[PDB]
Structure formats: C-alpha cells, structure tokens
Amino acid sequence: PRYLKGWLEDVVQLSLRRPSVRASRQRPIISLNERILEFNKRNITAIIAEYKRKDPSGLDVERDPIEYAKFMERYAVGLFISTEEKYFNGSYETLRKIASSVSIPILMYDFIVKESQIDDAYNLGADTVALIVKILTERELESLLEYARSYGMEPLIIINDENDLDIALRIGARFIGIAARDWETGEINKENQRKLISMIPSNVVKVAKEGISERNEIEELRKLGVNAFLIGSSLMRNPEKIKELIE
Numbered sequence: 001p002r003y004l005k006g007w008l009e010d011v012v013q014l015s016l017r018r019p020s021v022r023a024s025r026q027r028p029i030i031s032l033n034e035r036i037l038e039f040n041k042r043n044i045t046a047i048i049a050e051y052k053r054k055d056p057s058g059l060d061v062e063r064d065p066i067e068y069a070k071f072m073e074r075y076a077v078g079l080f081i082s083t084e085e086k087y088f089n090g091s092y093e094t095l096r097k098i099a100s101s102v103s104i105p106i107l108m109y110d111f112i113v114k115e116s117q118i119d120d121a122y123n124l125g126a127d128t129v130a131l132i133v134k135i136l137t138e139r140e141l142e143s144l145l146e147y148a149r150s151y152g153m154e155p156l157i158i159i160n161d162e163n164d165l166d167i168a169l170r171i172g173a174r175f176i177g178i179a180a181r182d183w184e185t186g187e188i189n190k191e192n193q194r195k196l197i198s199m200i201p202s203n204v205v206k207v208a209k210e211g212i213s214e215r216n217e218i219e220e221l222r223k224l225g226v227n228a229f230l231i232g233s234s235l236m237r238n239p240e241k242i243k244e245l246i247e
C-alpha cells in the first residue's frame with residue numbers, strides 16, 4: 001500500500017493480518033456494472049443500498065441483515081456490504097449469509113491491499129469488490145484490477161479527489177465511484193464530486209457515492225451522466241426511503 005496516516009493506516013494493518021477464507025461460493029457471479037447499464041437502458045433508477053453498521057462518522061446502527069437484504073432485493077440494483085471490522089463493525093460471516101439469501105449483485109466494501117481479500121470476496125459469494133485509490137499505488141491498483149477480472153469481477157474504483165481521478169484514468173478502470181466525503185475529515189463537498197464526475201468519460205460506469213438524500217439530487221446527477229447512486233446510512237435507518245428515491 002501507500003504511506004498512510006490515521007485511521008486509514010490502521011485499517012490497512014488490520015487487512016494485512018486478516019485470515020483468508022477457505023470455502024467455495026455457491027452461485028456464479030452476477031455483474032453489478034452490467035446490471036446498472038441494463039437499468040439505465042430501461043430508465044429505472046439504479047440505487048446501491050449499503051448494509052453498514054458503523055463508520056468513522058460515529059454511525060452506530062443495528063438491524064437484521066437478512067430482513068434488510070431481502071427487502072432491498074426488491075428495489076436496489078445491488079448491495080454494498082461493509083466487511084471491515086474495527087471501524088465499520090462488519091464481518092465476513094454477514095457477507096456470506098447475505099450472499100446466500102438474495103439474488104441481486106453484492107459489492108464487498110473493505111480495504112483491499114492483498115489478493116487473498118479478493119479471493120475471500122469471491123469465496124464468500126460477493127459479485128465484486130471496491131478498490132480504494134487512496135490506499136494503493138498505481139501498480140497495485142492495476143494488479144488487483146486484473147486479478148479481480150480473472151474471477152469475472154469488475155471492481156468499483158473509489159476516488160475522492162483529483163489526484164485519485166488522475167490515477168483512476170491511467171489504470172484502465174471501467175466502474176468508478178466518486179465519493180462525497182473527504183477520507184480524513186468526513187466533510188462533504190458536492191462541487192468537488194460533480195467536478196470529478198464531469199471529468200470521467202461517458203463509457204465508464206459512474207457511481208455517485210453518498211451525499212444524496214433526495215430524489216431531486218438523483219435527477220440532477222443522472223442528467224450529468226451518473227449511472228447509479230450509492231446511498232449512505234439513511235437507508236439503514238429508514239429502508240423504505242428507497243421507494244421515494246427510485247420515483
């Protein structure tokens with residue numbers, strides 16, 4: 001990984017020590033980026049819901065994961081599941097359980113710095129993974145992209161700033177998430193998010209990551225070329241809000 005500081009340095013260390021999974025998945029990959037493009041063709045709003053119990057903002061929420069996943073299977077284009085333990089209160093066990101219970105694409109959200117974490121995602125039943133430009137070098141990103149693709153997964157490349165964008169465009173990413181929150185402070189900057197979105201070619205599948213609470217924001221972003229919308233913890237509190245967001 002890169003030279004990091006603070007909580008990012010910490011999670012990367014936790015990721016390096018985490019045991020591998022030695023298990024076999026029980027359904028083939030279902031492509032999230034392709035399902036988004038299908039939704040776009042059909043003029044259906046494509047929302048990725050998050051199952052996320054904690055994050056560094058101080059979020060703390062509990063609920064039945066299967067109840068949530070089964071509800072979201074009826075409305076969301078896919079599910080993001082946080083598996084990082086210390087800051088997100090996630091677990092591989094929860095990923096494994098949810099993946100076995102629903103038939104929509106599942107993105108595993110963690111801090112991937114080693115190939116075995118991609119094996120883990122695959123073996124636990126995830127359909128794809130996020131890769132975070134801020135924790136990886138250019139060379140690592142290219143390596144991990146290629147490795148994920150060898151399993152049939154197209155990772156979501158997450159960017160926060162223009163430096164990350166420049167790298168994302170060099171590495172041959174096909175599916176990019178543009179984050180609203182600054183990694184270090186948590187501050188939301190929508191002017192920055194929109195500028196980065198405007199700089200990505202239209203053939204990349206673009207996901208606006210967080211900063212969204214209203215259908216009108218989705219409509220504005222869709223007009224600017226965003227393909228799908230990754231909503232934050234507001235759905236962990238009020239799942240039925242998703243119905244209002246999809247029209």
Ligand SMILES: *C[C@H](O)[C@@H](O)c1ccc2cc(OC)ccc2c1
Binds near residue numbers: 055057182186209232
């Ligand atoms: C996708 C990512 O985990 C995002 O949900 C997120 C939530 C909260 C948060 C807080 C920060 O500082 C307080 C920094 C980043 C951050 C990201």
